[PDB]
């Protein structure tokens, strides 16, 4: 479909470029169980 | 003696109030620091585009 100079009579095959991808990273809340209470024993000092 | 016993706990609650205001202020700074980075990311998308 060329002209006499070999130039194309058609409009060229266009291609719209891809959009830039949005970056995304992993986000996690920290996980952790509580610590149990230590054992008991009666002291030598009174309560006050 | 009961006055001193009350004064001890009111000073302790002063300590709790100062610590709590520090934690509120610091949380409230960190939330803005994260807000600014979310805004910077979704603004960087437009600049790249």
Q: Buried b vs exposed e over A16-48: b needs ≥16 C-beta within 10 Å?
A: eeeeeeeeeeeeeeeeeeeeeeeeeeeeeeeee
Q: Is B2 on the interface with A (CB under 8 A)?
A: no
User: Which residue reads 């409009």 in tokens?
Assistant: A11
CB of B40 closer than 8 Å to CB of A23: no
Report the distance separating Cα A10 and Cα A27, nearest Å: 51
B10: three-class secondary structure by DSSP: helix
User: Which DSSP string do the residues of B17-40 spell out, in sequence order?
Assistant: HHHHHHHHHHHHHHHHHHHHHHHH
Give dist(CA B27, CA B39) in Å, integer.
18
**C-alpha–C-alpha distance, residues B11 and B17, integer Å:** 10
Chain A residues interacting with chain B (CB cutoff of 8 angstroms) = 19-20, 22-23
The verdict on a CB contact (< 8 Å) between A20 and B48 is yes
Asked whether the beta carbons of residue A20 and residue B45 sit closer than 8 angstroms, the reply is yes
Q: Does B45 touch chain A (CB under 8 A)?
A: yes
The single residue listed with the structure tokens 């009111």 is B10
Report residue B36 as tokens. Answer: 């600014």
Resolution (A): 3.3
């Amino acid at each position: 479909n060329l002209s006499i100079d070999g130039q194309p009579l058609s409009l060229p095959v266009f291609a719209a470029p891809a959009d830039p991808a949005a970056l995304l990273s992993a986000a996690a809340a920290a996980s952790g169980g509580s610590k149990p209470l230590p054992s008991a024993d009666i002291p030598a000092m009174r309560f006050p | 003696q009961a006055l001193d016993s009350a004064r001890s706990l009111t000073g302790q609650l002063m300590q709790f109030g100062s610590t709590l205001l520090g934690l509120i202020e610091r949380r409230d700074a960190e939330a803005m620091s994260e807000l600014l980075q979310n805004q910077a990311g979704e603004l960087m998308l437009s600049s790249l585009r």
